[PDB]
């Protein structure tokens, strides 16, 4: 039992959260962009 266990474990718990929030937003991001580009293909196709 040293304070180092929980100390240097806490500063990893924070990295695990950060990647969680990142790759949540970087996933939805893809889908929103992919929804736009799909409906452009549906306009491009539809008028032609």
């Amino acid at each position: 039992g040293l304070i180092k266990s929980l100390a240097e474990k806490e500063k990893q718990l924070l990295e695990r959260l950060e990647a969680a929030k990142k790759e949540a937003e970087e996933r939805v991001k893809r889908a929103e962009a992919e929804a736009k580009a799909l409906l452009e293909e549906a306009e491009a196709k539809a008028k032609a």
Binding site: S5, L6, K9, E10, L13, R16, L17, A19, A20, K21, E23, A24, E25, R27, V28, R30, A31, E32, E34, A35, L38, L39, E41, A42, E43, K45, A46
Partner: protein, 62 residues
């Protein structure tokens, strides 16, 4: 031990959040397919209309 508690408060949130955001990334994408399909369903009817009208006009004209 005590560091094993710490890894379990995180490991729980980081699946709750990432399961939630893979069902918004599903949901937007499901509505995006169902819209493009429907903007072409209205395009399909329109063309038909224009052809049924068109032929009747040319029959009358002649």
């Amino acid at each position: 031990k005590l560091e094993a508690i710490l890894s379990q408060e995180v490991e729980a949130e980081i699946q709750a959040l990432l399961q939630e955001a893979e069902a918004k990334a599903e949901a937007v994408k499901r509505e995006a397919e169902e819209k493009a399909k429907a903007l072409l369903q209205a395009r399909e009817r329109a063309l038909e209309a224009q052809y049924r009208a068109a032929l009747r006009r040319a029959e009358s004209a002649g």
